[PDB]
Amino acid sequence: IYLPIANVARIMKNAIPQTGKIAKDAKECVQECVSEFISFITSEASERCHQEKRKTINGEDILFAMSTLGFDSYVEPLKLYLQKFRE
Amino acid sequence: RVQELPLARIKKIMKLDEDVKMISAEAPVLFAKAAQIFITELTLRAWIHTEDNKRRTLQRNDIAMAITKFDQFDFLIDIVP
């Protein structure tokens, strides 16, 4: 249900100054938030697919849901990541 | 590396959705990179409150303050007590 805490903590630590510290419950909080982020975006994409009578959540559905919900800035880096992923 | 995040766990979260039937191969891949972007931005915004309180330890209340202040985090409002 949650991404591994070690991975979440590593991303968090990379974001802040090298001398900063992160409390255990702050890492757990972000763990919860990023599952909610996935669920929130997925809900937008899934209702759209249901309205269009489509059975598969595609990558375009996820990207479009992100654009609709205020995460349009993610679209370009995600496309580059996925394209280098499948290259 | 972002590729290290487990796709099976991302797919499991996605499958909790009541209207999800089938998921493309690329959807969890996109969410892995999105998770990195989201964690980084949320952490940086919470860290504003850490430093504003003259602290060097990021605390859960710093994340809650960032959630309440920023529109991109509106969807997290029910996580805040």
Partner: peptide, 13 residues
């Protein structure tokens, strides 16, 4: 931009 999806997530329950 998020309000209606936030609501709908509450409504689905």
């Amino acid at each position: 931009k998020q309000l209606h999806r936030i609501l709908k997530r509450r409504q689905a329950r």
